[PDB]
């Protein structure tokens, strides 16, 4: 709601309590101090500008007095509205705000890790490993997923729990992601060449390299174009490249409603990773041109003990079939789990039972 | 990533371009201005404090010079790190930042508007009593009996002429005014439940009265807010009602949290409140949690129901939700039902309950009390 005010009206004085702040819609206002009954002007504010906001942010008194130079109309910003928005803001953005207030009158660790990660990337401490995906019935290796690893010389082998999230919600996903795709496709060509070299011509034609693509780099412009360049750079075919995505992409939709269709039109397979976790698929599933979905490991490890977690999984498999989507059950660590998973009708699987993620040299041996 | 610096080294001067900012790990530093080769000190910064951040935020030159008073070690904050975090921040929080920069610089030398206004307009309307509750019948699909109702919030005003009238519900739900408004909703809904049950007993429909369920929408904020279950219990006892007749409709998004929100539902369930997941299959998905949550109902959203007959794989999604629900002793309420053909398919797939225009639109208490009697 908006409020009219008379010329020369002292709206509030220096030292008052801070109920709310204002945004000027019409008119002009003067901010001033008072010292031994001398009146020193700080500035004149006009249309679009704000005042009374400092007291609300740090719960202290009015740093100055304010008087209307003419008839003005103000739009009210409440204390709760300000604190609400300041509290949700990033911890560094809050540091920045607080320090600016003081002067006008873990964050260190978070900043250092982001730079440590990026420096490691440039010192080439990251490399891709590849985990076999197998046909459950005949145990043949049908394809693989590219997984990012980091082994610093000083901190040994690093947990991906740490760096993956940090990378994904930063702009460094673009240069890193480009490197991931390029490396994964380079090694696909090498995999197919080795397969043809040992006269496994049909296995070579059906081989699928799964690459994880995050939201940021998907929604980023010129993605499909740069992807196509990298594909042609290694003389590869679209039917051997499968893009693993989180459900969350369809929250957006400026380019992200038909970007998938543009990917699908070129022959790239699209797969929904960690289905049944995070943003919900069931409606997103009727929209999206999906060829696969992956049943997360959290489901698979409760199949034998929890009998209604089994029911959830059975239902996902049957639903998937009903829309010509195929299933990859991941996290498989015991033969008994595979048995149930095949009886329920899941075609593919991946997990420790078959193979952990390994480097390209161990993987090339595995396929033979 | 961390950098050592010599005593008396001018790290940067006033008027330079701003490549990066620094955080002091060791030592002390002096910020100063220069005027006709007079050096006026602004302050001394020490361990843990920051400098060089202003130039990065608004792309302008260094407002001052900086010199190390002793041997110091600095941790670098890049421009990209700062802009990255500032850009994602709320539009008002960005306004606040930019205005503070302008005033500090001058000091030592000498849609967001619309979102904010609508929030206050909504709250003023609430206090001027422009809101009221309507009630939409939920029916048993097979025998068409009214089994219960959902309380729906209305705003009787031309200004609420959004016509896509969800909007204000969303504005309320993601604001702190959900607490005083929500309290009013719950109180009003429970008051009218007592009136519904009294009429039902008055016409010797004793069994229908015992099975009647009033569905109330409860948002995340007020659910996660402390002292919720206690205040709910007070309002229930205020109207002499039983927990088995009160059903709480919740969005899936609550299980993102879990400090209080894994067992808050169990604390509600322990008291006998039915819990229902509204708009299931939209927004967040608590599937790995849905084996855990004490859920008695879920509602198939209208967006699914209106595509059942045209889109044959939207039908498959709905069939699958119903079968899954049954497999964990959860019952289904299909909403948005506007044609008899939809109800047919919905009953064949096995959904027990329904609500929609086919049966009845939302109406005031009054038209609802008449509706029961048929
Ligand atoms: N140096 C300044 N330049 C411009 N505006 C100021 C200055 N100091 C204070 N203000 C504004 O005047 C207000 C006085 O009360 P607050 O501290 O609540 O919020 C203050 C600012 O919005
Ligand atoms: N009044 C002040 N009090 C304390 N520090 C300041 C003040 N003015 C500027 N600074 C710091 O000195 C730095 C000079 O360059 P920047 O403008 O990039 O960033 C500035 C702030 O970090
Ligand atoms: Mg993956
Ligand atoms: Mg509802």
Numbering used by the authors:
A (entry chain B): 6 to 110, 139 to 401
B (entry chain A): 6 to 115, 139 to 402
Reproduce the article's own wording on this structure.
The Bd1971 domain architecture is predicted to consist of an N‐terminal cNMP sensory domain (cyclic nucleotide monophosphate, postulated to bind cAMP or cGMP), a middle linker region, and C‐terminal catalytic EAL barrel. C‐di‐GMP turnover was increased ~8‐fold in the presence of cAMP or cGMP, further supporting the proposal that cNMPs are activators of Bd1971.
The full‐length cAMP‐bound form reveals the sensory N‐terminus to be a domain‐swapped variant of the cNMP/CRP family, which in the cAMP‐activated state holds the C‐terminal EAL enzyme in a phosphodiesterase‐active conformation. Bd1971 forms a butterfly shaped dimer measuring 90 Å tall, 90 Å wide (at larger EAL domain) and 40 Å deep. The central twofold axis acts to situate an EAL domain dimer (residues 158–402) over a cNMP sensor dimer (6–111). The dimerization interface we observe is centered around Ser348 and places Asp306 and Asp307 in a productive orientation, similar to that observed in other (presumed active) EAL dimers. Superimposition using the cAMP ligand reveals many shared residues/structural features between Bd1971 and CRP including the classical base capping residue (Bd1971 Arg108: CRP Arg123), phosphate cradle (Arg67/Ser68: Arg82/Ser83), and ribose‐coordinating group (Glu58:Glu72). Importantly, the linker helix (residues 136–157) is central to the productive full‐length bound form, contacting three separate domains—both cNMP sensors (one chain via the N‐terminal end of the C‐helix, the other chain via the outward face of the β‐sandwich), and the EAL domain (at the αββα start of the barrel).
